[PDB]
Ligand binder design. Structure first.
Ligand SMILES: [Zn+2]
Ligand SMILES: [Zn+2]
Ligand SMILES: [Zn+2]
Length: 178
């Protein structure tokens, strides 16, 4: 197994996947690494199994259809994995914890949002459809763009949103377009 966490790339108290060489800190994995379970399979392995059991699940889909799916176990897992893929980027640190807004010439957003809030919402089963999760994720970046206006720091939102969107298209097998 790897000697660093797959998400944050640090050593520490790591839990090792039994079906692949990845390792994780307890709370870097999503969901948090389960108490018992030997063997243990990580989220990457669990997603791969879904695909293998239903190869047709990789045929292209319309975003509008994906968003209306109810959050049954497989869609729950896919959203957890997509959230994890965002945390895998180091620029996610800017969006992880609760923001505050006091900048000359800007007003804070009406509905603040952050990664750890989405993480909690998923843990507590607060989303009934994929749309709920995707709307909160996109709102993180939209709030950032709006608040930072022409400061070059706005680009961090564009960057992390692009990681989100690329992974959303991959995980939910959105039909490729130009
Ligand atoms: Zn970690
Ligand atoms: Zn694994
Ligand atoms: Zn099948």
């Amino acid at each position: 197994n790897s000697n660093i966490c797959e998400v944050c790339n640090k050593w520490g108290r790591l839990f090792c996947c039994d079906t692949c060489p990845r390792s994780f800190h307890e709370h870097c994995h999503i969901p948090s690494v389960e108490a018992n379970k030997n063997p243990w399979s990580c989220i990457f392995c669990r997603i791969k199994t879904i695909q293998e059991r239903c190869p047709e699940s990789q045929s292209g889909h319309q975003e509008s259809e994906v968003l209306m799916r109810q959050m049954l176990p497989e869609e729950q897992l896919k959203c957890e994995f997509l959230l994890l893929k965002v945390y895998c980027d180091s620029k996610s640190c800017f969006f992880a914890s609760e923001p505050y807004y006091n900048r000359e010439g800007s007003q804070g957003p009406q509905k603040p949002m952050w990664l750890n809030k989405v993480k909690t919402s998923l843990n507590e089963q607060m989303y009934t459809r994929v749309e709920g999760f995707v709307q909160d994720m996109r709102l993180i970046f939209h709030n950032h763009k709006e608040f930072y206006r022409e400061d070059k720091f706005t680009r961090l939102g564009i960057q992390v949103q692009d990681i989100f969107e690329k992974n959303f298209r991959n995980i939910f097998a959105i039909q490729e377009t130009s």
